[PDB]
Amino acid sequence: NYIVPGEYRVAEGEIEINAGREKTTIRVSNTGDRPIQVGSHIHFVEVNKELLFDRAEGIGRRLNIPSGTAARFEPGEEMEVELTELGGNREVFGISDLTNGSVDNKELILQRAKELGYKGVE
Amino acid sequence: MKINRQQYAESYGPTVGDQVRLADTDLWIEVEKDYTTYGDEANFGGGKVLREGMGENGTYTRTENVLDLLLTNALILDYTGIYKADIGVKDGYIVGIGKGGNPDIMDGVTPNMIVGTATEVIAAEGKIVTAGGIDTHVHFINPDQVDVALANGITTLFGGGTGPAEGSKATTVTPGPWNIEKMLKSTEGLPINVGILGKGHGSSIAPIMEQIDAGAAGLKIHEDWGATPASIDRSLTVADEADVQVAIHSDTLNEAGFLEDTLRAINGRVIHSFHVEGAGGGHAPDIMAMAGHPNVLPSSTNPTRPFTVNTIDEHLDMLMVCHHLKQNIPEDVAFADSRIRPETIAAEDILHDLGIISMMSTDALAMGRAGEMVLRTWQTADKMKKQRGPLAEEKNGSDNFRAKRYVSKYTINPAIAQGIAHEVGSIEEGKFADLVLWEPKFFGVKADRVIKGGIIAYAQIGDPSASIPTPQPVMGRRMYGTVGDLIHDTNITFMSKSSIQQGVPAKLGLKRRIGTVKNCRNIGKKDMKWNDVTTDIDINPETYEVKVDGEVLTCEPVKELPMAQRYFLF
Amino acid sequence: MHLNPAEKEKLQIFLASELALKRKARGLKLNYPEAVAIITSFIMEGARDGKTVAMLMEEGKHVLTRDDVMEGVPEMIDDIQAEATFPDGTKLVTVHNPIS
Ligand code: NI
Ligand code: NI
Numbered sequence: 001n002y003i004v005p006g007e008y009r010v011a012e013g014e015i016e017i018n019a020g021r022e023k024t025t026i027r028v029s030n031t032g033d034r035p036i037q038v039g040s041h042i043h044f045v046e047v048n049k050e051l052l053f054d055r056a057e058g059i060g061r062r063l064n065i066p067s068g069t070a071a072r073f074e075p076g077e078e079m080e081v082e083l084t085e086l087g088g089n090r091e092v093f094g095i096s097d098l099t100n101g102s103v104d105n106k107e108l109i110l111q112r113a114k115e116l117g118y119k120g121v122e
Numbered sequence: 123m124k125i126n127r128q129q130y131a132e133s134y135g136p137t138v139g140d141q142v143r144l145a146d147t148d149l150w151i152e153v154e155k156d157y158t159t160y161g162d163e164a165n166f167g168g169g170k171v172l173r174e175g176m177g178e179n180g181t182y183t184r185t186e187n188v189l190d191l192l193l194t195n196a197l198i199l200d201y202t203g204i205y206k207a208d209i210g211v212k213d214g215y216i217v218g219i220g221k222g223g224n225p226d227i228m229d230g231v232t233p234n235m236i237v238g239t240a241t242e243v244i245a246a247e248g249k250i251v252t253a254g255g256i257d258t259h260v261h262f263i264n265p266d267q268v269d270v271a272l273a274n275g276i277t278t279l280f281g282g283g284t285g286p287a288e289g290s291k292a293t294t295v296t297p298g299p300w301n302i303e304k305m306l307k308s309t310e311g312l313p314i315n316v317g318i319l320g321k322g323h324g325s326s327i328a329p330i331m332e333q334i335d336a337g338a339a340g341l342k343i344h345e346d347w348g349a350t351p352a353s354i355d356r357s358l359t360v361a362d363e364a365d366v367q368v369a370i371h372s373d374t375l376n377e378a379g380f381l382e383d384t385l386r387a388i389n390g391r392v393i394h395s396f397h398v399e400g401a402g403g404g405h406a407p408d409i410m411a412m413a414g415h416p417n418v419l420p421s422s423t424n425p426t427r428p429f430t431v432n433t434i435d436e437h438l439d440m441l442m443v444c445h446h447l448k449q450n451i452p453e454d455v456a457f458a459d460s461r462i463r464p465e466t467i468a469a470e471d472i473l474h475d476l477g478i479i480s481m482m483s484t485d486a487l488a489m490g491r492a493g494e495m496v497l498r499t500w501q502t503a504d505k506m507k508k509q510r511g512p513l514a515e516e517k518n519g520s521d522n523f524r525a526k527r528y529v530s531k532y533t534i535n536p537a538i539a540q541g542i543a544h545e546v547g548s549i550e551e552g553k554f555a556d557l558v559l560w561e562p563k564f565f566g567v568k569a570d571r572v573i574k575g576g577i578i579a580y581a582q583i584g585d586p587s588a589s590i591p592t593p594q595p596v597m598g599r600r601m602y603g604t605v606g607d608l609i610h611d612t613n614i615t616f617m618s619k620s621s622i623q624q625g626v627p628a629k630l631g632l633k634r635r636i637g638t639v640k641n642c643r644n645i646g647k648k649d650m651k652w653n654d655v656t657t658d659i660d661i662n663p664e665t666y667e668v669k670v671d672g673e674v675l676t677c678e679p680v681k682e683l684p685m686a687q688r689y690f691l692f
Numbered sequence: 693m694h695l696n697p698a699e700k701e702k703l704q705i706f707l708a709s710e711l712a713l714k715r716k717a718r719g720l721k722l723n724y725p726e727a728v729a730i731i732t733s734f735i736m737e738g739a740r741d742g743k744t745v746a747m748l749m750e751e752g753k754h755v756l757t758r759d760d761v762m763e764g765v766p767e768m769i770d771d772i773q774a775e776a777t778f779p780d781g782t783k784l785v786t787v788h789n790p791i792s
Contacts, residue, residue: 088225585701
């Protein structure tokens with residue numbers, strides 16, 4: 001019968017974030033010398049250049065992590081990260097200036113990434 | 123990706139089905155629906171979602187659906203319902219309830235709630251957001267009382283007064299066009315929405331109506347100025363022709379007639395009954411029967427809310443507002459006995475719980491407390507939940523119906539009564555951005571934040587000379603929304619249609635926003651929210667035994683209440 | 693005295709803590725504001741006495757116990773932060789769950 005002011009009585013079960021979206025699992029390494037934290041909603045092909053992964057897999061995708069959380073990559077280490085598709089109009093403007101438009105133009109995005117030497121571009 | 127409900131409630135706030143306890147009371151509010159998409163929640167901070175190229179859109183300008191303010195992950199408690207949503211505010215007006223974010227990368231974003239370069243983010247996660255309380259019974263006596271209202275989530279003050287004057291100390295009346303103009307000029311420095319009530323007394327139409335033409339937002343009929351049937355008739359005629367509300371403080375002495383004569387004078391017209399119970403003032407002792415009429419909108423002052431052991435003893439010595447009494451005079455002692463009847467207060471508790479009394483008010487500094495309307499409203503709600511038990515419409519062990527019924531008693535019902543519902547009163551699209559953010563442990567006691575017109579006007583904030591805002595002394599403080607010419611843009615001065623048309627704001631040089639008082643004479647008891655119950659109330663002239671539909675009305679006073687010594691130093 | 697507004701505000705904390713101590717002396721259970729004031733004044737007095745920030749952050753958890761405050765108060769006070777003038781300058785002290 002203990003009472004605590006402003007306490008939650010949450011329901012039972014869990015809740016799935018980003019339901020009904022395609023999921024991928026990719027291997028990401030940090031070849032730099034400083035830690036790199038990646039946000040939940042940032043477009044994954046425009047992440048730091050020092051990040052080594054299959055960049056073509058990062059097009060139209062973001063980290064499938066709880067909103068507001070980040071994934072940490074220490075120097076010289078590798079992680080398995082789950083990526084989920086973006087939503088809405090599927091357009092990305094800004095960040096690294098790699099897309100500035102619809103994310104469907106894959107080959108143009110990889111060409112731009114290779115122009116600035118992003119690691120992992122085939 | 124699984125997330126347990128505890129972590130989600132800790133991060134973004136309670137979701138559908140999660141219940142929150144209101145302060146230290148026994149009331150649990152359960153979220154009915156959520157407008158956000160799981161995994162796409164909007165939050166602000168380093169590495170969070172709302173960033174350029176991310177949940178914030180860095181392409182569109184201000185005019186292209188980009189908001190001016192976004193309250194994120196808010197827990198809206200309103201007469202409409204209890205649900206989780208994000209609030210968009212543009213130009214100081216609520217332009218959307220739903221999911222705000224970046225339409226290019228997010229799913230289900232409300233089209234007009236795009237987060238852009240002009241957006242300012244306020245984190246409402248873990249907080250309860252309510253509409254600013256409306257106070258229709260305010261005696262303008264002390265300029266310091268405004269903050270006392272703001273600390274309790276009150277954003278509109280309706281009433282009259284010219285300061286610590288006897289007529290102002292007794293009645294909510296700003297008598298005369300000159301005094302109305304002076305008070306309207308004075309309101310330029312009050313960081314709160316203001317409505318001014320005139321003197322609704324006189325045998326002729328013109329003296330009353332010139333007050334309305336001068337800027338009065340309504341009329342007050344008090345027994346101190348003489349509540350004769352002629353005054354009621356003239357005031358109601360003026361209100362009907364000018365479309366303003368009339369507040370009645372009936373004749374306690376029954377000098378010119380009983381309650382039936384007053385009802386005949388009203389003649390089925392829409393009137394607002396101040397302190398309908400009677401202890402504050404009214405026809406001794408059957409005034410509360412007014413609460414049973416469809417054309418009467420009943421309210422109730424706070425000092426009798428709820429019924430406590432000390433309520434009877436405290437109220438005896440506070441009667442001096444109307445006129446002073448001596449303890450050894452046979453007549454005035456009899457006046458006190460017939461004025462404070464414990465049976466009427468016990469019945470008023472249940473009437474509030476039964477949806478018969480529709481509104482709540484302070485009637486401040488005139489046998490009322492300026493900053494206890496919400497506090498005493500929720501204290502009454504908790505006491506009635508403890509005594510009468512759950513209502514008929516309740517389900518799932520939640521108090522959603524009771525919360526909706528009691529929140530309407532000081533948010534939307536006063537706004538509908540005064541005709542200002544189109545601007546303020548509830549969290550709806552197109553309404554003024556008057557919001558109050560409460561921490562669930564301080565809900566109804568201290569307002570965490572008070573935002574007026576899209577700008578934070580009041581805040582429970584700490585030391586101004588620290589590295590961060592949190593360190594002690596945390597106290598209520600006026601924010602940048604009450605500094606300089608900004609005080610003119612975040613506040614509304616409600617005035618009559620005739621005064622607005624005549625150019626009174628321009629003639630007086632008023633810089634505040636001007637609100638129109640309209641749709642007052644076409645409403646009734648059924649227009650109230652969750653409190654549209656009309657019945658017959660029998661008050662015994664001998665024993666003051668209040669009866670409804672043949673059953674007695676009484677409750678036992680409570681020695682201990684929530685929202686109490688646990689929170690207040692004194 | 694040459695008082696900036698900081699001292700004017702913190703004198704109120706000192707007065708509130710003095711009232712709280714007076715109430716506690718007669719066996720009263722402290723509520724949220726008296727407990728907050730007492731821990732804040734203890735922090736400030738310790739800072740004046742020359743204690744380091746770490747020492748104050750430690751001992752702030754033992755000035756009041758769960759039995760000296762009313763029902764539900766310890767859960768209300770998640771943390772207490774106070775800005776005080778240590779010998780090296782003005783510094784911030786944060787005590788997490790000061791009532792155990
Ligand atoms: Ni009155
Ligand atoms: Ni009054």
